[PDB]
Amino acid sequence: DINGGGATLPQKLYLTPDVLTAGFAPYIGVGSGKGKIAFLENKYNQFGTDTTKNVHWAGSDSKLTATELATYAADKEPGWGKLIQVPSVATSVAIPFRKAGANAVDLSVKELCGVFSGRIADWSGITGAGRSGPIQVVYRAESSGTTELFTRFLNAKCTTEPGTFAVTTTFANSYSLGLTPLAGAVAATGSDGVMAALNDTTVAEGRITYMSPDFAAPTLAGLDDATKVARVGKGVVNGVAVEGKSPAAANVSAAISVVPLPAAADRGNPDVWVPVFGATTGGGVVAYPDSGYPILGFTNLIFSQCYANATQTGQVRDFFTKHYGTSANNDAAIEANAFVPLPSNWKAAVRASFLTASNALSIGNTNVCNGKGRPQ
């Protein structure tokens, strides 16, 4: 079997029949931090107890760090080939909450920032929401790509809190003044563990969190129910009151469509393949959009260019052919699970480097992978 796992944000997508193609074992959702370790160190123990199995790929919504990349290049690349890091799909980060009320909850960015810094501790501080009583933040206990995507937004946009939010996979380490300002914030493990805490009816109402849109509501329609999933983006633009948007994929697709391709000359560097959003556009960073739903990013795949086993090599190529295909692809499934397909130019770029046989970066390239590859 080809063994993969990691990020929980897209786990239900990868578990959907026929999204992963022939030869792939069922995806094991354990978090992006564990997915990166599993791949980089070939440690199946991050996925399960059968450590005779080898790891072949990971899902991650946390980018590979400079240290991770350099260590793999020195330790693993000579025998296993280059690693490949590519976007899989684009995603919003949803803000589901448990607090009854007929009114739409529509967070301004300033309000969102105050909720997650602890400055706003009561629902009455959310204008127009018609709710009052304590807010309780639920967050991911472990190294999480959802946390990275979310804190990247807070770092860029929460610019008038007492403290500042650092970009991190560990939410408890983000705010400069710590979690102490929050009263009774609750940590849970996995997208599912956080949603279970959010939905726990044995505690008082008031909980709020950040979440994969595939987990944030039971169906796509539920993402548009602003009594359960917050709109974000409420404000005033050119003198006129604007409403925020739901985290439905339709509200981030336009912004995703104009994300620049990775710089051609540097496409051998896995770091350039995953765009990150930031306050301002420039130097590889893409500005968070001023229209549509504001909190977005990419979730990614990590693969090897080379596999020791030729059948596995072919099966990996078949998966890339589908997932990045012009047609006969996974786009319908991607949308059904609340995500945004990659734009056509992005699919073409991924194919041109990693599929097209003549390219030096292509999976299973006979010249590059001659006598090399990850173990089967």
Numbering used by the authors: 1 to 376
Quoted from the paper:
In the present study, HPBP with a single mutation was unexpectedly crystallized during a crystallization trial of a certain protein–RNA complex, as was the case for the first crystal of HPBP. We attempted to crystallize a protein complex composed of proteins of 53 kDa, 52 kDa and 11 kDa in complex with its substrate. After crystallization trials and optimization, small crystals were obtained, and a high-resolution X-ray diffraction dataset (1.35 Å resolution) was collected. The crystal belonged to space group C2 with unit-cell parameters a = 94.3 Å, b = 87.1 Å, c = 88.6 Å, β = 90.82°. However, the calculated asymmetric unit (727644 Å3) was too small to locate any of the components. The results of SDS-PAGE of these crystals indicated a protein with a molecular mass of approximately 40 kDa that corresponded to none of the target proteins. To identify the observed protein, it was digested with trypsin and the resultant fragments were analysed by LC-MS. Mascot search of the obtained molecular masses suggested HPBP, a member of the DING protein family, as a candidate. Surprisingly, HPBP (space group C2221, a = 96.3 Å, b = 86.8 Å, c = 89.9 Å) was identified again. Taken together, it is plausible that HPBP was a contaminant in the BSA used for substrate preparation.
